[PDB]
Amino acid sequence: YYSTSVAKLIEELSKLPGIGPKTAQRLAFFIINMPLDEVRSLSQAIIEAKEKLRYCKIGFNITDKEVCDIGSDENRDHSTICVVSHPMDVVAMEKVKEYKGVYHVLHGVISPIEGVGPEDIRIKELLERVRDGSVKEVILATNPDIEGEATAMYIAKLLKPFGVKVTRIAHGIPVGGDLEYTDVVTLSKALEGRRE
Amino acid sequence: YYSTSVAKLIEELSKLPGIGPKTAQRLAFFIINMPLDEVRSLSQAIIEAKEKLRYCKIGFNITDKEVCDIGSDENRDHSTICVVSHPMDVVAMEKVKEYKGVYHVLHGVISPIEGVGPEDIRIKELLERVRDGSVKEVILATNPDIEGEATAMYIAKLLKPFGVKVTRIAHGIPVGGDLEYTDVVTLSKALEGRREV
Ligand SMILES: [Zn+2]
Ligand SMILES: [Zn+2]
C-alpha cells in the first residue's frame, strides 16, 4: 500500500513506454526521496519540453525554432529528401556522418489495424514539395514491415509522374549476420531483391 | 563425483560446441536413463551419419550418394546455381521454400587469416560448371561478412568473361528491424544500396 499521491505517480509513470508496473513503483519511491530542488527540475523539464516544442514548418520534425537546424544549415543540400517514420529516425540517419541531405518524419505509418491512413500523416504535405522546389532525390526510409513497406510503396509509385528520382532503402540481410542464423522471411526477401 | 563411465560421457559430450558442463551432466543422465534400445538408437545414429556422409560430385554438398537429391532432380532449374559457403547454408536456403535452382557449395571462404586461398575452397569447379554447362544465372550467397564478401567478389571477377547474369543476395535491414537499433554499416548500405522503387 501507499498514499494516494504516490499511487497516482505510479499510475502516471506506468503509462510510459518500457516503464512497467514494478519499474514505476521503484521510480516513484526514488523520485519522492529526491532532494526537492531536483524533483523540481525534473518536473520543470517535463513541462518545459512540451510547451517549448515546435513542429518544423518544412520537415515537420521536432525542434525549438520554426524551421529545423538540419533544414536551416547553410552548407546543406535540401534536394536529397528522406521520408522517415519518427523523430529519432532522423537522429539514427544523422548518426551516419555521410549523407548531407534532408528529411520527412510523419509520426505514423499506414496502419488500418491501428487506424491512421494517408491523411493523418504528411503525404500530400510532401506532395506539395517535390513538384515545388525541384528535388533531385526522394528516398523513402520507413521500417521494412507491412506498415513501413506498404506505406512508402503507396508513395513511391506517385513519384513516377513528375521527373523526381524515387528510391527505397534496402530490405535484406544485415551486415555481419549469416544465412545460418537468419529467419526465413528475411531470407525469402533477400533472395527476391537480389540483383547485385 | 561421477562413475568413470559417466564422467567419460560427460567429458566427451562437453567437447561438442555450445554444450556447457552443467548441460553435459544433465544430458549424460537423461541418456543413461533412457530405455536401452533408445540409447542404442542414438549411438548408432551418430556412427552411421558419420560413415554414410559423401559429397555430391556436382555441387559438393554433403549427401550420401554420388548425386544429391536436388541435383539428380530433373525438374529443378539446373541453369541457376546458388553459391553458398557450407552445407547448412543450403538448408537455410531450401527452408525458404521459394527457390527453384541448384547450389554450388564452396566449403569455406577466402580467409587470409586462417590461410585458405581461392583454391582451398571449391571455386574452380564452380567455373568449370559455368564454362561447360549452360548457366543463365549464378547467385552469390556468401555471408555479408568481410571474409564472405571478399569471397563473393573474387568469384564475380572470374565469372565476368562468361555470358552469365551474376547476382548477390541483398544486404540492408532485415524484416522487423527498426532503424533505431540497426547500425551505421548496415544503414550505409540501405542508402548506398538504395534503388528506384
Ligand atoms: Zn526540419
Ligand atoms: Zn549436388
* A137/chain B closest Cα distance in angstroms: 10
Selection from A132, A133, A154 nearest residue A142 by Cα: A154
* A34/chain B closest Cα distance in angstroms: 32
> Which experimental approach was used here?
X-ray
Selection from A144, A190, A185 nearest residue B142 by Cα: A190
Residue of chain B whose alpha carbon sits nearest to that of A165: B196
To 5 degrees, how large is the angle CA B143–CA B149–CA B155? 110
Residue of chain A whose alpha carbon sits nearest to that of B166: A196
* B185/chain A closest Cα distance in angstroms: 7
Q: Which cell numbers in the block locate residue A96?
A: 551516419
* B35/chain A closest Cα distance in angstroms: 34
Of B92, B179, B189, the CB nearest to A175: B189
The CATH number of domain B76-169 is 3.40.50.460: no
Spacing, Cα B187 to ligand 1 middle (Å) = 21
Please give the single-letter amino acid code of residue A153: M
Selection from A174, A183, A145 nearest residue B181 by Cα: A174
Residues in chain B: 197
- For the sheet with B77-84, list strands across it: B101-105, B77-84, B137-141, B165-168
Rounded Cα gap, residues A146 and A31, in angstroms? 40
Q: Which ligand is nearest to the CA of A102?
A: 1
A184 with B96: Cβ contact below 8 A: yes
Q: How far is CA B51 from the centre of its chain?
A: 20
Rounded Cα gap, residues A140 and A171, in angstroms? 12
Spacing, Cα A54 to ligand 1 middle (Å) = 10
Chain B CB contacts of A172 under 8 Å are 169-174, 190, 193
B143 with A178: Cβ contact below 8 A: yes
Spacing, Cα A59 to ligand 1 middle (Å) = 4
Rounded Cα gap, residues B8 and B15, in angstroms? 11
Spacing, Cα A88 to ligand 1 middle (Å) = 13
B179 with A99: Cβ contact below 8 A: no
- Around ion ligand 2, residues with a beta carbon closer than 5 Å are B 56, 58-59, 61, 68, 71
Rounded Cα gap, residues A175 and B192, in angstroms? 13
Give the 3-state secondary structure of A81-143: EEEECCCHHHHHHHCCCCCCCCCECCCCCCCCCCCCCCCCCCCCCCCCCCCCCCCCEEEEECC
Rounded Cα gap, residues B84 and B103, in angstroms? 7
